[PDB]
Design a binder for this molecule. Structure first.
Ligand SMILES: CC(C)=CCC/C(C)=C\CC/C(C)=C/CC/C(C)=C\CC/C(C)=C/CC/C(C)=C/CC/C(C)=C/CC/C(C)=C/CC/C(C)=C/CC1=C(C)C(=O)c2ccccc2C1=O
Ligand code: SF4
Ligand code: SF4
Ligand code: SF4
Lengths: 122, 117, 183, 189, 395, 125, 406
C-alpha cells in the first residue's frame, strides 16, 4: 500500500480537478444554442452534408503502418533491457554477452527493415 | 557545421538586447511629419475660416468621404473671406482612405491633415 | 452560466468586474484577415509594436479559442457567408472589431462586390477608421474595446442593460435627419 | 482500459515492474490498433453485430458461459492451500529478481523472443510492405507528366459557391446552367 | 543501499502525505502559470518584444487572466462529436500529467512538523518507467480528443499525435537504459544518489541528447509540435475545443513539459544537487535549498523549450518519425551496447580498451549521422525533360 | 383569432414607421389583426425571438450596428421553429446575401408599401 | 476510392491568407487533388476604377496586390503615361525615385512573404524579424508618402510630391542596415536544417510547368531561367542600373525562398545606385496641362497645399487657378487607345491592360496580377505531397490575394 497511496492521493486530486474543470467549462460562462456554432469547423466553409462516405463512414489510411507494426514489437522487446540494466552489476559477464547477442539479433531485424525500405513512407 | 545553428545565436542575442517596441499608448511612437492623419479645417490668424466651401476636396475624394455645402458670407454673418464659405462640412471617416487627395485639391489650404490618428 | 444566475448584490458586481478585467486581458484575436488590414494587424503583432503586451498575441487559429474577431480587411459578397460561419463558430462572449474602412462601411469600394460594412452580417462592437489603420490606431480601438468589455454587465444586470439600451436606441433619429445647417 | 486496470492489479500483486511495463507497451499497442481500426474498419463506423451465421450467436454465448463456469469450478479454492507472501522474493528488488530469473533460468526463452521479433518484422516486410512496382508517384513525378498536374485539366474548377451552399459537394454552374462534373470530386456523392 | 530507501519513503502520515500531494499539485499549477507567462515574455525578448506586461503588475496576472477567461467562456460541445469520449479526452490528458510528477525528487530528506520525510511525494522501485507509463497514457488524451471531435482537422491532429508516439516513445525508453546501467536502479531517488560523484549528463551524453529530443517530441512542442501544427491544421487536435477543455489540454501539455524536464534533471543533471558554483557551499544540498536547485534546473530545461520554439520551424511528422527511427533509435541502441561493453570491460580491468572503444564509437556515430545529414540527403539532382508546352531556352 | 405579432427590427425609426404604414392593423380584412413589436437593437430582437410568439419578423438589412441579414441568419440558426423572416435590402446587389440569410422574402429599399404587404401576406398564408 | 477525405483549407486558415480556399482530396495525408477557390476577396476595383478619374484610380490600384503598392502604382502610371505618349517626358528624378521605391517595396514584399511562410511553417521568430526589417522600410515609406500602405505616391507623370529633406538620409541608413538585419533573418532560415528539410524538394515545378501555366517571378526563376521584366523590356530606366537577375535551379520551394532572399540584396544594391544617381530636380512632368497641380507642404497646421501655390492660384494666376481646378476635379484626358504595360512585381509579371475612350476616366483597367496566374501552380506543387508540403508550396508561391481577386 505504502509508496503508492501518495500516487493515489495525487491522482484523486488531479481527477477531481479535471472533472470539476470540465464541469466548470460546461456550467460557467454563457451558453446559447446555434446550429452554425455546433457544426464541424471547416475553415468557415459549410460542413459536408451529413451522409457518410469517403471519411467518417470510411477509413483514413496511414502510410506508416509498417513502422507502427514494427513499433509494437520493438517497444515490447526493448523492455528486456530495463531489468538487465538495473541488475547489470549483479548479473556478470554472461548476462552482458547474452544481452549483446539479443541486441545484435534486434539489430539484424532493424537493418533488414531499414535497408529494404521498411522505414520509408511516413 | 555550426552554421545550421546560427538562428539560435540570433534569438539568444536578441534576448539580451533592449526590446524595440514603441511604448504606445503610454509612450506613443513618433509618426512621420508627413503622415496622413485626421483632416483639419484651419483658420486665418484673425479667426476667419479658410474653407470657402468650393467642394474641391469633396470633388477629388475617391471614396466620396467628404460632404460640403457652401453658403454666402453675408455681411451680418461672415465665416470666411470672399463670397462663399463651407457651412456644412462632414467627413465620413468610415469611408476616408487617407489618400490625401482632398488636401492636394484645396485651393485655400483650409483643409490640412494632421499627425493625430 | 451559473455566473448569470447570481443575485444582483455585490456578488454579481464583483463577478462582473473581475470577468471584465479577465476578458479585456487575454483577448485572443481570431487568426483571420482579409486584406492589407491584415498586414497592418500583423505589423501590430510585429516587434515595433507589441499586441502581446495586451495579452492578445495568441491569434487563435480556430474560432473556438478566439474571443475577438478583428475583421481586418474588406469583405466581399462571396466571403460574407464564410465570415459569418467563423463568427458563429466562435463561442460567446464574442466581439467584432471592424478594422479599416472596408470592414466598417465598405470604404472606397462602394460597389456590387463589397458588403459595405461587416455589420451587415455580424454584430460590430467597434469601428476602426483607416485604410489601413496604422497599428497605433488598432491598439487604440482595441483599448476602447477593452473599456467596453470591462463595463460589460451580466445576468439580471445584463437584461436591464439590454432593456435600457433598447429604450435609448428606439428614440435616436436616423443620420439622414440630422440636417443641422444644411441649406 | 482493461490493460491499464490489469497493470494496476499487477502493481497491487507485488509486481510493480510488470504493471508499469503493461501500461507502457499496451498503451503503445492499443494506440497502434486504434490506428489500424481507422485504417481498415472506419473512423466512426458502427458495426451491426447482427449474427451473420444462423444460430452461431447463441451457441457461442453458451460455449463461452460453459467454458468460464467450468474453468471457475476447476479453479475452486486454491489460496486456502497456503499463500506465501511475495515480500521474500521482491526483497532485493522486484526488477532485480526478474533480471536474475530472466537471464539465468530463462535466457533461452529470452533469446527466442528475438526470433519472435525477427519473424514479426519479416512478416511485416513481406505481407504489408509495398515495393517499387506500386510506390506512389512523388510530387515531382506527378508534376512532370507532360506537365500533367497543372496543365492537363489545369487545377480543376472549384466546387460551386452558392448562397446557402458552399460545401465541396456542390457542383459549379456551367454557362448553360448545367452542373460541371469536374467541379466536384468524383468520390463525393 | 536499496532505493527507494525504506527508512524515508512509505512512512509519511496520512495528513503529511496529503499535504505533500496538495503542495505538489499547487507547485505544478504555479509552475504552469509561470511557464506560460515566462515563455511569452521570453519569446518577446528573443523577438525584440516585451510580451505581456500590462495585465497586472509587469503582466504577472496574464496567465491567470487567460485561465479565468477560458473558465468564463462558453463550454462548447459541438454536434457530431462522440460526446462521452470527447468530454473525457481532456481528463485523460490531464490526470496522467499530474500523476507522473508524483515520483519526481524535488529535494532530499527534510524534517517538517517533527517528521523526517523526503522532499518528494513518493518514490517507486520503477519510478522512471512509472513516469513513462503515465506520459504514455496522457497521449490518449490528445489522440481521442482529435478523434472524438468528428472533424477533419482534429482527426489529422490526433493521427499526428499517434505518429509522434511511434516516433519518440521507443527512443525515450531506450534513453533510460544507460541511466539505469550507471545508477543500477529505476527509483528516481536512487538515480539522484548515484549522481553524487558526477552528473550523468557528462557520462551519458548520447543518452541525454536522445532523451532531450524525445522530450520535445513527447510534449508536442516545437520544433515537433505536430498534433497542434497551427500553420497546417488550424488548431490540430484541440480544434473544436473551447473554454477549460482547451485550457486543460494546454495545462496537460505544460505539466508534461515540467514533468519531463524534471525527469531530465533527475536522470542527467544530478536531480536536486547544487551546481558547481554552489556545490562547494556547506548546506547547499541540505535543507530546502535542493528545491531551489531542482527548480533552477527544471527552468533551464523550460528555457530550452522556449528557445527551440523561438528558433526552429516545425518538422513534418514523417520527418520526425524518420529522425526517431533512423537516428534516435539506432543511436540509443548503439550507445546502450557501447556503454554495456565499456562498463563490463572496466569491471574486468580492461581500462584503456574501454577508453578507446567509447571514443571510437562516438567518433563513428557522429560521422555516420553526419552522412545521413549530408550524404544520404543528397543536394543534387538531374534536370527535367521538356514537353508539349514549348519551353524557353535556359541559360 | 390571435393578433399576429410581427417583429420590426431597424435602427432607423423611419424604416419601422414605413413598415408599420405598409402593414396596417390588418393587412387584409380576411387576415387577423396585427400587433407590432419594435426593436432597435440586435440583442433585444434576439431576446424577443427567443421569447417566441412571433408570426413574422421584418429585419432591416441596413441596420447600423447589426445588419438585418446577419440577424436573420442568427435567428434561423438559434431559434427552433422560428417564424418566417422578411429582410429589407439596401441595394439590388444585396439580393444574393438576402438569399444567403435564408430569409423567406426580401423587399428592397425604399420600402414599397404594396410589395411589402404582398410579401407579408404570402409569408403568413 | 472511398478512403480519401475531401477537406477545405478554406478562407479562414493560417496559411491560406484568410481568403484563399484550397480544397484538398487527401488519401491519408497526401494531397491527391488540389482545387483552388478564389474570389473571397473580390472587390470590384477594376469596375470601380471606371467611375473615377485618372490620378484617382491610382488610389484603387495600389489596393490590389497591397503588398506591392508601388508596383501597382508604377504599372498604372506607366500605362497612363504611355497612353499619353509622355513616358519619355517624365523627369529623371521621378523615374529614379520610382525605381528606388519599387526596390524598397520589393524588399518589403519579400519580407512579408518570408515572414508569413516561416509562420506557416512554424518559424515563429521569422515573422517577427521580417516585420522588424519591414518596419524600418515602412518608416521610410511613411516619411516619403505619409502612409504605411496603399500609398498613392506615384502619380501619372511623376510623383505625388518631392522627397522630404530627411528622406535621402533615411534611405541611406536603410542601405546600411538592411543587409545586416536581413542577416538575422537569413540565419534563422537559410542554412537551418529544419527549414531546408521543410522546403528543399517541396512544391517542385519544372520550367515546362512554369511556361504552361504562365508562371513568372521567383517561381519561374527558381527553374534557372533568368527572366526578369527589368532586364527584358526595361522600364522606368532600369537599364541604367547594374544588378543581377537572381535565379536558382532547384525548381522547388527552397529555391524560390533563396531567390527572394537574394533579391532583397539585389534591391539593396539598386537602392544604393538610386541614391548615387538621385539628383535635385522636378518630380512631375513640366507640361502644366497634365502636371498634378497640388504642391503639398508642411506647416504648423499640418500637411496641405503650400502657401506659395495658394498665393499663385487664388491671388494672381487665373490660368493657374483654372488648371488647378480642372486637373484636380476632372483630371487629365487620356487620348483613346489600348496599352499593355508590364512590370516585374515581387511575385512576377504584373501586367496592366489599360484602355482609354478619350475621357477623363479609365475606360477599362485590367490587372494581370502574377498571383492570379501563379495560383494555377497550386495543383502542380501540392498534388502528391503531404499537407505539410502543400503549406510550404503555397507559401513559396507567395500569393497576395488582393492581386488575385482585385
Ligand atoms: C480550471 C482552472 C480555472 C484552474 C485554476 C488554475 C488556472 C487559472 C489555470 C492553470 C493555467 C492555465 C491552464 C491557463 C490557461 C491558459 C493556457 C493553458 C494557455 C493559453 C496561453 C498560451 C498558450 C500562450 C502562448 C501562445 C503563443 C505562443 C502565442 C503567440 C502566437 C503568435 C506568434 C501570433 C501572431 C500571429 C499573427 C502574426 C497574426 C496575424 C493573422 C492574420 C494577419 C491573418 C490573416 C492573413 C494571414 C494568416 C497571412 O499570413 C497573410 C499574409 C499575407 C497577406 C495577407 C494575410 C492574411 O490576410
Ligand atoms: S477644398 Fe478646401 S476650401 Fe474648398 S470646400 Fe474643401 S476644405 Fe473648403
Ligand atoms: S484623405 Fe482621401 S479619402 Fe480621406 S477625406 Fe481626404 S481625399 Fe477623401
Ligand atoms: S480599409 Fe483600406 S487597407 Fe483595409 S482592406 Fe480596405 S482598402 Fe485595404
Amino acid at each position: 500500500m505504502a509508496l503508492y497511496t501518495p500516487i493515489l492521493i495525487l491522482g484523486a486530486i488531479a481527477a477531481v480537478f479535471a472533472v470539476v474543470s470540465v464541469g466548470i467549462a460546461l456550467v460557467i460562462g454563457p451558453r446559447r444554442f446555434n446550429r452554425s456554432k455546433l457544426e464541424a469547423y471547416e475553415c468557415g466553409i459549410d460542413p459536408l452534408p451529413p451522409v457518410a462516405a469517403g471519411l467518417t463512414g470510411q477509413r483514413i489510411p496511414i502510410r506508416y503502418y509498417l513502422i507502427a507494426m514494427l513499433f509494437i514489437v520493438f517497444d515490447i522487446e526493448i523492455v528486456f533491457l530495463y531489468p538487465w540494466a538495473v541488475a547489470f552489476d549483479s548479473l556478470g559477464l554472461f548476462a552482458v554477452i547474452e544481452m549483446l547477442l539479443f541486441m545484435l539479433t534486434v539489430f539484424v531485424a532493424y537493418a533488414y527493415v531499414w535497408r529494404r525500405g521498411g522505414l520509408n513512407w511516413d | 557545421f555550426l552554421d545550421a545553428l546560427a538562428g539560435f545565436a540570433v534569438t539568444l542575442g536578441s534576448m539580451f538586447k533592449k526590446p524595440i517596441t514603441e511604448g504606445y499608448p503610454e509612450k506613443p511612437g513618433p509618426v512621420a511629419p508627413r503622415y496622413h492623419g485626421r483632416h483639419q479645417l484651419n483658420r486665418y490668424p484673425d479667426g476667419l475660416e479658410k474653407c470657402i466651401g468650393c467642394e474641391l476636396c469633396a470633388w477629388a475624394c475617391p471614396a466620396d468621404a467628404i460632404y460640403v455645402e457652401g453658403a454666402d458670407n453675408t455681411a451680418d454673418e461672415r465665416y470666411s473671406p470672399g463670397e462663399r464659405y463651407g457651412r456644412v462640412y462632414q467627413i465620413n471617416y468610415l469611408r476616408c482612405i487617407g489618400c490625401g487627395l482632398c488636401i492636394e485639391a484645396c485651393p485655400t489650404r483650409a483643409l490640412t491633415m494632421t499627425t493625430e490618428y | 452560466g451559473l455566473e448569470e444566475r447570481l443575485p444582483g448584490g455585490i456578488l454579481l458586481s464583483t463577478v462582473e468586474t473581475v470577468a471584465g478585467y479577465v476578458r479585456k486581458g487575454s483577448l485572443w484575436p481570431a487568426t483571420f484577415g482579409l486584406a492589407c488590414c491584415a498586414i497592418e494587424m500583423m505589423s501590430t503583432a510585429g516587434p515595433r509594436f507589441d499586441i502581446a503586451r495586451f495579452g492578445m498575441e495568441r491569434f487563435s487559429a480556430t474560432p473556438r479559442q478566439a474571443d475577438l474577431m478583428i475583421v481586418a480587411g474588406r469583405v466581399s459578397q462571396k466571403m460574407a457567408p464564410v465570415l459569418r460561419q467563423i463568427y458563429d463558430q466562435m463561442v460567446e462572449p464574442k466581439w467584432v472589431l471592424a478594422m479599416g474602412v472596408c470592414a466598417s462601411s465598405g470604404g472606397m469600394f462602394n460597389n456590387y462586390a463589397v458588403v459595405q460594412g461587416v455589420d451587415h452580417v455580424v454584430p460590430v462592437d467597434i469601428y476602426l477608421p483607416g485604410c489601413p489603420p496604422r497599428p497605433e490606431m488598432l491598439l487604440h480601438a482595441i483599448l476602447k474595446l477593452h473599456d467596453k468589455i470591462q463595463q460589460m454587465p451580466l445576468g439580471v444586470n445584463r437584461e436591464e442593460a439590454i432593456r435600457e439600451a433598447e429604450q435609448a436606441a428606439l428614440a435616436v433619429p436616423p443620420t439622414i435627419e440630422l440636417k443641422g445647417l444644411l441649406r | 482500459c482493461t490493460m491499464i486496470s490489469l497493470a494496476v492489479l499487477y502493481i497491487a500483486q507485488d509486481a510493480p515492474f510488470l504493471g508499469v511495463v503493461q501500461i507502457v507497451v499496451y498503451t503503445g499497442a492499443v494506440m497502434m490498433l486504434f490506428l489500424f481500426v481507422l485504417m481498415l474498419i472506419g473512423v466512426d463506423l458502427t458495426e451491426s453485430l447482427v449474427e451473420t451465421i444462423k444460430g452461431h450467436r447463441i451457441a457461442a454465448l453458451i460455449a463461452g458461459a460453459g467454458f468460464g463456469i467450468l474453468v471457475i469450478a476447476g479453479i475452486g479454492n486454491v489460496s486456502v492451500a497456503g499463500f506465501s507472501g511475495l515480500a521474500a522474493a521482491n526483497s532485493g528488488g522486484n526488477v532485480e529478481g526478474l533480471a536474475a530469473l530472466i537471464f539465468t533460468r530463462y535466457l533461452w526463452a529470452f533469446e527466442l523472443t528475438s526470433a519472435l521479433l525477427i519473424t514479426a518484422a519479416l512478416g511485416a516486410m513481406v505481407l504489408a510492405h509495398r515495393e517499387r512496382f506500386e510506390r506512389r508517384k512523388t510530387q515531382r513525378e506527378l508534376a512532370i507528366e507532360r506537365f500533367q498536374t497543372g496543365g492537363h485539366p489545369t487545377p480543376l474548377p472549384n466546387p460551386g459557391v452558392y448562397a446557402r451552399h458552399n460545401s465541396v459537394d456542390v457542383p459549379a454552374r456551367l454557362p448553360d446552367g448545367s452542373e460541371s462534373p469536374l467541379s466536384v470530386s468524383t468520390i463525393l456523392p | 543501499m536499496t532505493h527507494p530507501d525504506p527508512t524515508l519513503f512509505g512512512h509519511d502520515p496520512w495528513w503529511l502525505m496529503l499535504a505533500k500531494a496538495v503542495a505538489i499539485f499547487v507547485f505544478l499549477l504555479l509552475t504552469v502559470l509561470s511557464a506560460i507567462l515566462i515563455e511569452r515574455k521570453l519569446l518577446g525578448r528573443m523577438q525584440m518584444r516585451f510580451g505581456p506586461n500590462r495585465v497586472g503588475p509587469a503582466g504577472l496576472l496574464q496567465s491567470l487572466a487567460d485561465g479565468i477567461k477560458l473558465a468564463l467562456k462558453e463550454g462548447l460541445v459541438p454536434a457530431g462529436v462522440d460526446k462521452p469520449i470527447y468530454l473525457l479526452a481532456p481528463v485523460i490528458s490531464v490526470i496522467p500529467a499530474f500523476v507522473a510528477f508524483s515520483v519526481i525528487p524535488l529535494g532530499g530528506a527534510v524534517s517538517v512538523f517533527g517528521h523526517r520525510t523526503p522532499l518528494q511525494l513518493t518514490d517507486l522501485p520503477v519510478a522512471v518507467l512509472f513516469i513513462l507509463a503515465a506520459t504514455s497514457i496522457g497521449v490518449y488524451g490528445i489522440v481521442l480528443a482529435g478523434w472524438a471531435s468528428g472533424s477533419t482537422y482534429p482527426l489529422l491532429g490526433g493521427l499526428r499525435s499517434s505518429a509522434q508516439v511511434v516516433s519518440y516513445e521507443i527512443a525515450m525508453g531506450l534513453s533510460f537504459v544507460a541511466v539505469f546501467l550507471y545508477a543500477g536502479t529505476m527509483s528516481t531517488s536512487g538515480i539522484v544518489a548515484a549522481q553524487d560523484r558526477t552528473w550523468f549528463v557528462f557520462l551519458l551524453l548520447p543518452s541525454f541528447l536522445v532523451y532531450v529530443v524525445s522530450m520535445v517530441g513527447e510534449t508536442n512542442r516545437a520544433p515537433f509540435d505536430l498534433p497542434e501544427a497551427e500553420g497546417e491544421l488550424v488548431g490540430g487536435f484541440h480544434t473544436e475545443y473551447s473554454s477549460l477543455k482547451f485550457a486543460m489540454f494546454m495545462l496537460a501539455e505544460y505539466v508534461n513539459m515540467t514533468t519531463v524536464s524534471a525527469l531530465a534533471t533527475t536522470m542527467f543533471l544530478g536531480g536536486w544537487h547544487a551546481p558547481f558554483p554552489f556545490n562547494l557551499i556547506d548546506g547547499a544540498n541540505s535543507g530546502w535549498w535542493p528545491l531551489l536547485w531542482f527548480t533552477a534546473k527544471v527552468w533551464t530545461f523550460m528555457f530550452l523549450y522556449f528557445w527551440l520554439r523561438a528558433t526552429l520551424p516545425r518538422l513534418r511528422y514523417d520527418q520526425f518519425m524518420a529522425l526517431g527511427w533512423k537516428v534516435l533509435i539506432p543511436v540509443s541502441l548503439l550507445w546502450i551496447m557501447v556503454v554495456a561493453i565499456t562498463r563490463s570491460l572496466r569491471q574486468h580491468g580492461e581500462g584503456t580498451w574501454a577508453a578507446w572503444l567509447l571514443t571510437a564509437a562516438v567518433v563513428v556515430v557522429v560521422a555516420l549521422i553526419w552522412g545521413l545529414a549530408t550524404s544520404l540527403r543528397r543536394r543534387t539532382v538531374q534536370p527535367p525533360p521538356p514537353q508539349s508546352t514549348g519551353a524557353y531556352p535556359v541559360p | 383569432s390571435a393578433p399576429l405579432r410581427i417583429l420590426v427590427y431597424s435602427d432607423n425609426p423611419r424604416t419601422r414607421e414605413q413598415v408599420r404604414l405598409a402593414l396596417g392593423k390588418r393587412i387584409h380584412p380576411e387576415l387577423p389583426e396585427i400587433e407590432y413589436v419594435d426593436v432597435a437593437t440586435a440583442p433585444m430582437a434576439i431576446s424577443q425571438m427567443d421569447a417566441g410568439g412571433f408570426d413574422l419578423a421584418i429585419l432591416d438589412g441596413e441596420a447600423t450596428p447589426a445588419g438585418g441579414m446577419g440577424v436573420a441568419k442568427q435567428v434561423k440558426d438559434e431559434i427552433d421553429d422560428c417564424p418566417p423572416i422578411l429582410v429589407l435590402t439596401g441595394r439590388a446587389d444585396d439580393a444574393w446575401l438576402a438569399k444567403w440569410s435564408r430569409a423567406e422574402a426580401a423587399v428592397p429599399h425604399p420600402i414599397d408599401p404594396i410589395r411589402l404587404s404582398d410579401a407579408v401576406v404570402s409569408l403568413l398564408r | 476510392a472511398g478512403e480519401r477525405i475531401v477537406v477545405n483549407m478554406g478562407p479562414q486558415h493560417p496559411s491560406t491568407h484568410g481568403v484563399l480556399r484550397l480544397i484538398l482530396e487527401i488519401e491519408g495525408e497526401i494531397i491527391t487533388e488540389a482545387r483552388c477557390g478564389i474570389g473571397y476577396l473580390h472587390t470590384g476595383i477594376e469596375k470601380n476604377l471606371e467611375y473615377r478619374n485618372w490620378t484617382q484610380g491610382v488610389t484603387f490600384v495600389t489596393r490590389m496586390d497591397y503588398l506591392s503598392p508601388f508596383f501597382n502604382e508604377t504599372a498604372y502610371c506607366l500605362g497612363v503615361e504611355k497612353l499619353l505618349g509622355i513616358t519619355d517626358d517624365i523627369p529623371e528624378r521621378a523615374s529614379v525615385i520610382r525605381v528606388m521605391l519599387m526596390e524598397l517595396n520589393r524588399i518589403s514584399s519579400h519580407l512579408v512573404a518570408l515572414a508569413t511562410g516561416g509562420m506557416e511553417l512554424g518559424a515563429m521568430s521569422a515573422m517577427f524579424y521580417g516585420f522588424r526589417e519591414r518596419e524600418e522600410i515602412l518608416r521610410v515609406f511613411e516619411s516619403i508618402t505619409g502612409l504605411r500602405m496603399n500609398h498613392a505616391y506615384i502619380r501619372p507623370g511623376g510623383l505625388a510630391a518631392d522627397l522630404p529633406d530627411d528622406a535621402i538620409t533615411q534611405v541611406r541608413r536603410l542601405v546600411e542596415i538592411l543587409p545586416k538585419r536581413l542577416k538575422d533573418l537569413e540565419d534563422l532560415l537559410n542554412e537551418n536544417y529544419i527549414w531546408k528539410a521543410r522546403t528543399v524538394g517541396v512544391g517542385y515545378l519544372d520550367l515546362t510547368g512554369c511556361m504552361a501555366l504562365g508562371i513568372t517571378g521567383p517561381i519561374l526563376r527558381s527553374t534557372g531561367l533568368p527572366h526578369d521584366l527589368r532586364k527584358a523590356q526595361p522600364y522606368c530606366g532600369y537599364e541604367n542600373y547594374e544588378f543581377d537577375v537572381i535565379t536558382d535551379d532547384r525548381c522547388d520551394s527552397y529555391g524560390r525562398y533563396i531567390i527572394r532572399v537574394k533579391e532583397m540584396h539585389e534591391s539593396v544594391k539598386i537602392v544604393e545606385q538610386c541614391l548615387a544617381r538621385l539628383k535635385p530636380g522636378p518630380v512631375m512632368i513640366s507640361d502644366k496641362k497634365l502636371a498634378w497641380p497640388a504642391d503639398l507642404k508642411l506647416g504648423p497646421d499640418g500637411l496641405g497645399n503650400s502657401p506659395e501655390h495658394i498665393a499663385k492660384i487664388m491671388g494672381r494666376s487665373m490660368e493657374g487657378l483654372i488648371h488647378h481646378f480642372k486637373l484636380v476635379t476632372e483630371g487629365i484626358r487620356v487620348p483613346p487607345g489600348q496599352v499593355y504595360v508590364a512590370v516585374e512585381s515581387p511575385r512576377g509579371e504584373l501586367g496592366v491592360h489599360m484602355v482609354s475612350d478619350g475621357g477623363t476616366r479609365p475606360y477599362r483597367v485590367h490587372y494581370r496580377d502574377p498571383s492570379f496566374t501563379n495560383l494555377q501552380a497550386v495543383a502542380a506543387t501540392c498534388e502528391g505531397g503531404m499537407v505539410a508540403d502543400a503549406i510550404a508550396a503555397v507559401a513559396s508561391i507567395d500569393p497576395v490575394m488582393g492581386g488575385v481577386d482585385r
